[PDB]
Amino acid sequence: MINVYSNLMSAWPATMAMSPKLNRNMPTFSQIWDYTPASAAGETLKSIQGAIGEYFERRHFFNEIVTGGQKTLYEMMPPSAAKAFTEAFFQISSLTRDEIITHKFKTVRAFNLFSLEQQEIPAVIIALDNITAADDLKFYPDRDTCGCSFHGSLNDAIEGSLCEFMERQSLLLYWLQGKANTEISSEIVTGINHIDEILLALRSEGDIRIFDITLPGAPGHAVLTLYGTKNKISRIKYSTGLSYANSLKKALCKSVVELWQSYICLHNFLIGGYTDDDIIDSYQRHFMSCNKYESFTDLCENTVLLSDDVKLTLEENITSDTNLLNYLQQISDNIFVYYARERVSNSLVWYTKIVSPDFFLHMNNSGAININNKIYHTGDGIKVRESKMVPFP
Amino acid sequence: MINILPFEIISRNTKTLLITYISSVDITHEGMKKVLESLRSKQGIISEYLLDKLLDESLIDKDKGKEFLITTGVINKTKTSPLWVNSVIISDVPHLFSNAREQWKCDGVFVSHIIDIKDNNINVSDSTLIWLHLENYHSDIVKRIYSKFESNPGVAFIQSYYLKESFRIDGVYSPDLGTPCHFCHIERWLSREEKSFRRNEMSWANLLQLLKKYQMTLPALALGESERGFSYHLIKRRLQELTGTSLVKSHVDNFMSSVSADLITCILCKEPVIHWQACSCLER
Amino acid sequence: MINILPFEIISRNTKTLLITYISSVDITHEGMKKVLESLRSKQGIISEYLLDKLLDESLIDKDKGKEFLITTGVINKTKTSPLWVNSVIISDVPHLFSNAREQWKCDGVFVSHIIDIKDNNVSDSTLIWLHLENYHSDIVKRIYSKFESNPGVAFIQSYYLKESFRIDGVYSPDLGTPCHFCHIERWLSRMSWANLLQLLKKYQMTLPALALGESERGFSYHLIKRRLQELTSHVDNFMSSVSADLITCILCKEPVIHWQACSC
Amino acid sequence: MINILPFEIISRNTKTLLITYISSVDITHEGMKKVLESLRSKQGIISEYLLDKLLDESLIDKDKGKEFLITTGVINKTKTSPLWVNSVIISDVPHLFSNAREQWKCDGVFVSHIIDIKDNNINVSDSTLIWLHLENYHSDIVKRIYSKFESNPGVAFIQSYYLKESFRIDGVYSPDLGTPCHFCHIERWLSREEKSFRRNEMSWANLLQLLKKYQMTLPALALGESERGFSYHLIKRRLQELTGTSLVKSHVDNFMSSVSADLITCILCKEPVIHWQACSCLER
Amino acid sequence: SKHELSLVEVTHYTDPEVLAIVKDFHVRGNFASLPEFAERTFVSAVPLAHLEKFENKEVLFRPGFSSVINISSSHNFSRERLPSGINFCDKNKLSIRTIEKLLVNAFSSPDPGSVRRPYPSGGALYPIEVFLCRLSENTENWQAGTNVYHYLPLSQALEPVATCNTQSLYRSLSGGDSERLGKPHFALVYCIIFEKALFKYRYRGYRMALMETGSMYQNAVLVADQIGLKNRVWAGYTDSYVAKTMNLDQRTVAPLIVQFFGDVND
Amino acid sequence: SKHELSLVEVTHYTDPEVLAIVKDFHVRGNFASLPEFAERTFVSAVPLAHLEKFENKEVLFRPGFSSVINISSSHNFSRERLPSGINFCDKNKLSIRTIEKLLVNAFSSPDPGSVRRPYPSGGALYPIEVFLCRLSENTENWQAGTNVYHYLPLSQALEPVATCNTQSLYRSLSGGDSERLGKPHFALVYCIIFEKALFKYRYRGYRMALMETGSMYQNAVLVADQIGLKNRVWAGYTDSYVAKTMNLDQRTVAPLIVQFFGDVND
């Protein structure tokens, strides 16, 4: 369905298609394809909006990043922030602190999440291509899209970027230490037909666990849904989904659909006869190598619950509706919002990335990363996991 | 249920004529003229008990007067309970339906309440048909009504509104029966109205539009009393087909379907519409 | 007259940030926060009476406050009239349009001059149609250089990419609509086409149309006329390219958006 | 038959680029540039003998140069004889097609004669495609042409004419293949243009019209050079699809069908038309 | 599962102009057929009186003439197809095994490794799907509570689809004429996936799909006769209601024909 | 003849809005399929490369999951339907008697006084007609020079239709792909009389007709297998050309599907 095609001379991708489906209670999967594929799942319109938004996001952070001169760290931003970036980059490269502060980085616009003071941060952290900050890659060679978001409203883009920030920082600290706040009942019934249908499907094919892995003390809920199966007929031996929201119910429902989306795309990749030469993205090729019951069992049997009883209900509490910015600021003042905009008709659409050198700068601790930051130090968690990248796409 | 159908009984001095949609009969009885005189005052419905009592006063054989009144088209028996117990009309112009509750009882149409869109805490019984009529259209008005009532048991909706020079009556949106909603209809019409020379109304222009919050209004010409008088009659007849005294059976292939009327030419157009690929009415 | 443009206002611990399409501003004075709070509610329409009533209520300084909002890209003066007095056609095949000025008057289209691209020695409020059988980025840049600064000027470009006849969206500095180079960058963002356009520049040579005959030129003649007729008016009239497959004769309209990296 | 396709060969000093619809190739050979230079002058068709002679002069392997020229989209082999040996254009504006016989040879389109509708004793060979183009429409003109040629072996007709703001190219009328004639088309269009809100265009109004001798004209707007330039190109491309160098294959479900073009918006519409119940083309 | 096809692969070749136009047409033949509409709708354009004039007749290519070439009934080796069951009774229990014989024989090869089915399909695309509907409490069930299943002709397996109650599913499938229908044990419902029917052959794929559906129900007709089941192909149902009831997304898939099965007796 | 129905009786109940709309749709799926258009047309929207991905597969109601209810192939008592014949050879003579067995068994009762046919029809209207096309000189003929006939399923007789030569009739019916088809002995052509398909049920009658057509060709498929005839249902033909060639008025009747018959050998 939808089925918009564009020729080789177009500004627009070759295909956008909404997928047909027999079951009215299964989610809609919409997808865009043009030489990775961007996709999204859920309610029909949101599936389309997601897929368009995901395509726009990737395009911007891979092709459209305008730099703004070439300045040293202490020249481009206030001093406390430039120290924080210096100490991040010091860990990420063999290069020394002398080399790091004399170096002129390509710059992008940004504002402080808390104070709204305007400054610049290094473009090398934001742009995913080699050409934008080519002479800066020695300092920061492993880049990703953690905290990235596209939306028609700026408050929405920032809300989105925050949720993505909290997802990944939660996920990394979860990965490294093994601690989760709580487990939700794997037999939980949400009342939402497309969520319940997915969960019932999963329990029939294999086993699920559902952990709340939110940053300790933070408001809201990062919910991580996990799946495994020994079953030899099944091609998906392992899958995962992760979302953050104020609501535990929403965060769980989002998480279950994120999971189904990874489960379904890989399943189709597999049954279609698609080869290694189709898999381009680095994090995707890793996620495919993790498709085995080991991945599930390694997570589950090493998880430590800070509350051992299983949550039969999706109720609120005194922590979960506090202020996320106050919580984040107590940990660090140096959290910056990259932003950009474009005109579409008479509207503005918005790109944002939440970035902090006092948190993890990307989610690949098998690459070059700031392992020491305000939420983790070397030797706090499981030592073997400091070296290995999480099984998450 | 014995339904009374439209007839007249006219007499000057000697002669007496029954005139109905089916026939014209020269009444030579005195009791039958009495009964016919009695039935003409009775508005729409009447109980088989009361009919027998009218016949018994006039000395007519109960079964042989019922065969008369049925065959000549004065009445008909109907035995099947409807899918919708009752109806309500929710509208931004409730003044336009002030007398409709009384008047449309003779058409066999049970309308419980005329409701203003401005009201709060409007409730609806199970198995009701909600007619939302709007002179000033806005999609959010419909969203509000669906939000409130979509999960009401046995519920179904009709929407009426104006677009360009046309009066649009959507097909029946029954969540139970799985039929297209308002938004499936209005998208059929808006594609049709654009200069594409193509049925499918989808470019990257449309894809970008879908990123914005779904809200809209429609262009439509200024209504007079006559355009409202036209609209009032179409609403009644559509409610009558669905829930009222049937006068002409509808085929099963267009019973639930949309009806669109050109207010200039006064031509009707009955069209069944498909589900819009982007609409969510099926997923709910 | 005056159109209230789109913007956002992030406002947090005492501080308030105005971000427009063009600019970023630390909103110091609190009455301007109220001005900008209110004005966020508008959708692109106000008489100066409306705007000055809002300002004078705020007590900013009605004269200077209008200067601030114009500067920052919050508001601006929209031309009440239609935007172009006339058009002019500049071409590397101007022989193809000799009788165009004479003919097209009947369709309510007013082309004033045909111009040869090979020239040396263009009014106020002028739409410039640059039609090129032999395309080169520098030819468009050349024309953008000469007249980019003219009062009320806009541009429109047409050229041939193998089997497709291309008509870019209208590039209007005053309206703020994307240029030719915004089009080319978004296309090339996706031996490749860029590989081809690179060599052509790198070894100095234009891109020819692939074997245009009379009939193809006739097909092109008429599209140009009807496109000029459309511009004689929602934003999407301007921010829309037309693409015409010369084999199948199918026209295909597509929306336009800027490249951030582009100057225009 | 080796068909030459649209390409260019361009050089300044050092570099040489072949640009075709399929590809863009950096030519590092000297003989291949020579051959490519030779093929660009050759208008449309060329004999496998002559191609081999161009390759042999340049010292290119005959089979390994043919694989080059074929894969890069400079040429293609075609092996199947067409349904129509040749074409003629009969028109009330033959001036409009003076150069068409020469010009459309590079499009691979063999048009034997441009004929004036004013001529007498116009003959046509077997298996010809007759293109009747009319700026001033009259049904009797078409009747005359059908009368003359309907029984010619292997014959087929296309008709082009203007209606309202549109340029109409009828589907191919092949008496052998059993396809709809001109009058099946024009009746599709005239029903569509009337304000009925109904597909079937039949009342007693129409029945009475059928009593009068079938003759008519059409309303249509004043054509400029550009509308003729548009029309000339559509005619060529349609003749090229049917009888010429294929550049893009057509699906089998719309190969024979009508093409209608709005002269304002320049939008094409390909529609297969049914036989008009009243037309006699099937009975002949 | 071994032979799974994702519709996302199909939808890559979909012409959306074609899809819209086929669906717009399709919906003209959908019925609103319920007991509560019986006295305010009709099905037949020809009155009851005059119907027998049109039933079980031949149309001639030479109307009025009788010069034929007769062919003997000595060449016939078949059975007469049984009268199509009406007024069904579910006094008896019916096994799953009897339903399994119907599904395996009518739609699948005897060799469970094979892909060749016992009916042909344009392009070997097989755009029609068979669903199975449990309509009686005396019908035996594979999985408790589940009254709609989807049959996988190659895998030769049932896939659970719905746990709607027996009454609702029979209400939807029987439409207005359930009184005469009676109490059948189960029904097959045949459905067109539009995008799979249209993606290769365009408009002609719809026709090819609808004819495929008849090849399927006829194999069912023939198979049922041989194992002692009366049946009836059935068109009097509200199309959208059967879809909703079977949890089908009508944007993708639609019920073409319902076919009833069971006994006729005391 | 005993069971003759005049279409003039049918046409009394015809909605002409319905008729026009069904025909307008129908014609979208007609093909222009000839040898002289082979290099300038195509049939498949999916390239040759990618086709095997879509052939002989299942679509799931639960894509990605495999929790099914397996049904044994021990319940199967049928034969495998033979591969559909391609590249036909007419080295052998084929009798009229063998064609007579096909027609009688597939379309008629064993009792020649009966009206019940061996496939069902909506409203017992039977709006589909079978024509028989002699395509080889080695095929035996009932009446010399006559290569098209119309089969009367109740009367159980052939009615002469056309004396077009064997070559022309095979040209029209085989369309562009005759090379691969080869030399079959005969073919059945199934046709819809539009007004008979629409007069009672309106739009839904078209669907019911097109499904009926498949029930018919499937009986042919099954019957042919049992008497030693390879066959192939066939959609690659120019619809209007087959009609003209069989002297059909397209305003009334149209070819839905062609089905080929004969031997495959040296």
Ligand SMILES: Cc1cc2nc3c(=O)[nH]c(=O)nc-3n(C[C@H](O)[C@H](O)[C@H](O)COP(=O)(O)O)c2cc1C
């Ligand atoms: C496509 C199709 C739809 C049908 N629909 C119905 C129906 O809605 N109601 C019904 O009672 N019978 C229906 N039938 C059964 C026919 O009425 C039956 O086949 C016909 O009357 C001949 O009777 P027989 O099958 O007993 O020989 C249908 C048959 C077909 C092929």
Ligand SMILES: Cc1cc2nc3c(=O)[nH]c(=O)nc-3n(C[C@H](O)[C@H](O)[C@H](O)COP(=O)(O)O)c2cc1C
């Ligand atoms: C409606 C229909 C149309 C068909 N059309 C064609 C056709 O045009 N050309 C062809 O070679 N085969 C055609 N076939 C045969 C199928 O290709 C064949 O059934 C399928 O490939 C499966 O192969 P099998 O029948 O040998 O098992 C058609 C089959 C059906 C049911």
Ligand SMILES: [Cl-]
């Ligand atoms: Cl939330």
Ligand SMILES: [Cl-]
């Ligand atoms: Cl309310």
Ligand SMILES: [Cl-]
């Ligand atoms: Cl003459």
Ligand SMILES: [Cl-]
């Ligand atoms: Cl009825």
Ligand SMILES: [Cl-]
């Ligand atoms: Cl093909």
Ligand SMILES: [Zn+2]
């Ligand atoms: Zn809807």
Ligand SMILES: [Zn+2]
């Ligand atoms: Zn630009």
Ligand SMILES: [Zn+2]
């Ligand atoms: Zn005709």
